[PDB]
């Protein structure tokens, strides 16, 4: 980091942000579940994200 404060998921959260994850607050709590890990996550909100729904 270089000036600023430390989020807990940010630089995981950054790329979810890339990949179209506009949803922090589930990204979270997906992050939350894994402990941080992304690509896990990813399979995660992949899941969870039901058939067009959000």
Same mark, same amino acid.
Do not use: W, Y
């Given at each position: 980091?270089? #000036?600023? *404060?430390?989020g807990?998921? /940010?630089? /995981? =959260?950054? /790329? +979810? !942000? *890339?990949?179209?994850? +506009?949803? !922090?607050? &589930?990204? =979270?709590?997906? =992050?939350?579940?894994? $402990?941080?890990?992304?690509? &896990? &996550?990813?399979?995660? =909100? !992949? /899941?969870?994200? $039901?058939? #067009? #729904? $959000?």
């Amino acid at each position: 980091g270089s #000036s600023g *404060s430390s989020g807990h998921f /940010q630089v /995981q =959260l950054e /790329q +979810l !942000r *890339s990949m179209g994850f +506009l949803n !922090r607050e &589930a990204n =979270l709590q997906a =992050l939350i579940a894994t $402990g941080g890990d992304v690509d &896990a &996550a990813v399979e995660k =909100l !992949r /899941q969870s994200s $039901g058939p #067009s #729904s $959000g």
